[PDB]
Design a binder for these strands. Structure first.
Lengths: 275, 275
DNA sequence: ACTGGGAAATTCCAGTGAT
DNA sequence: ATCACTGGAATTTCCCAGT
């Protein structure tokens, strides 16, 4: 038998909580979770239905896939991992209260030691590897299901990794959001100056991205024009057609080149430049 | 009575207090009239003496019961949070080029006060039962304590002299106010024009934009919600003194912190006549 | 009793200006 | 070149509001 992830966790928008915040972290939602309806990380076991248990732990994003210093917290969690029974009737199982508690950099070595001491090492990575640098802003869930064989001995199935889950404090992997913009129309000739207030971006890895049917342009600005990661002063690009007869609605959004993430689109109208 | 005179006061705003983690030495406090082309430093002159002696500089509280401050002076010839070196015998004027302010953590406050007492760092001999009230960690004063010699070489302790207060640039509340950028620097004399203004960090509960002319005083209109991550303000210009303005008039526009009434450099704004 | 989010407090660090 | 220093950014802690 083997495990497949039916509903991946949502990658973005989750805030890892420190222990100093004595409140337990949130509940990780599934990809397709919408503000209306709430999905949850969900797996399915193909090749077996009946009594079993599941352990979920955090491992690193990048390929050694060693146990992450962060902890799962929530119901049925201890020593930074979740563990509980599967339903024997169903072959689909969901996890409604998985929270991520980030540990501090100074408490790293202690955290790693606990992973080893608690035998929380799904891919049995040697301790040699586990003195590499960790990305504390990204984790993967690791599903480790145990079923019964025909004799009723526990059978451990291959661990499956989720997609990465990113801390939304991390600007390099956060959601892009335009909060306020001082102007939403401009000359088709381009070069109109726009003040745009946004959520935290990295000035070396952000652009303003105008799009239409089979068209794209970028607003002009330097890294100096990005103010304290939360504002961009830029000039609009010229529109494809230099002699518009009438206004033309296009979309304006933030774009992060590194991972090609886009923000929610906003309406911008290029106007005919007849003075 | 030989006495100490402050030739060059310390510049009050601009400089950060540094934590121990940021390293040994915390920069050099500059003089009032320090510029990029001519860097000045705090300077005293000893009137009515020449020859060998000592000078101690320590930090004291801004407010009248001048107790020793929990923060430390660090740099050349500093120990136990105070500066102490031999007075130059030849010259009567003395300046200090490596004074840095090292701020202590809130956690280590009671320990720091205990060090001040243990080291006999109490220039105004304040009783210990005053050394427990609230300290303003955002502001200190330099205390210059000069010891000269009488003709037989016995120490004569001159009166302690206080500097102007020095404020932590990094601390919100005490940071220097600055208008970095603005989308428009003109508009109707009636008001109601929307300005996107980019600024250094301000507290939205303790900030306002201040229009001033000769015998006029007005404020831009905005809510706390319009302060975006402490470094941008979207506001509406107030009405000019005279709504029957014939031809343009230039006013000053600056950030003001009501709590302590501090201001930014002024930025020109011109009220235009309404068409 | 728990949740969403802003900001103060502390730490880190890339790129300078003084030498 | 070195490295003290400058100022932006990242990390960690604290706190408010609302159900």
């Amino acid at each position: 038998p083997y495990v497949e992830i039916i509903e991946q966790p949502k990658q973005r928008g989750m805030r890892f909580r420190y222990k100093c915040e004595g409140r337990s972290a949130g509940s990780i939602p599934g990809e397709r979770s919408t503000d209306t309806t709430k999905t949850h990380p969900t797996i399915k076991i193909n090749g077996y239905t009946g009594p079993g248990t599941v352990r979920i732990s955090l491992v690193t994003k990048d390929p050694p896939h060693r146990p992450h210093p962060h902890e799962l917290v929530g119901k049925d969690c201890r020593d930074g991992y979740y563990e509980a029974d599967l339903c024997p009737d169903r072959s689909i199982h969901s996890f409604q209260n998985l929270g991520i508690q980030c540990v501090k950099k100074r408490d790293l070595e202690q955290a790693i030691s606990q992973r080893i001491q608690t035998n929380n090492n799904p891919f049995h990575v040697p301790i040699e590897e586990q003195r590499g640098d960790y990305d504390l802003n990204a984790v993967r869930l690791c599903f480790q299901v145990t079923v019964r064989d025909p004799a009723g001995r526990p059978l451990l199935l291959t661990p499956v990794l989720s997609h990465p889950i990113f801390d939304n404090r991390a600007p390099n992997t956060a959601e892009l959001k335009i909060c306020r913009v001082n102007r939403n129309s401009g000359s088709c000739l381009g070069g109109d100056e726009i003040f745009l207030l946004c959520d935290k971006v990295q000035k070396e890895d952000i652009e303003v991205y105008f799009t239409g049917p089979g068209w794209e342009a970028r607003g002009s600005f330097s890294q100096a024009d990005v103010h304290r990661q939360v504002a961009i002063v830029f000039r609009t690009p010229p529109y494809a057609d230099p002699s518009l007869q009438a206004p033309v609605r296009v979309s304006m959004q933030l774009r992060r080149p590194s991972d090609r993430e886009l923000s929610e689109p906003m309406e911008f109208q290029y106007l005919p430049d007849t003075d």
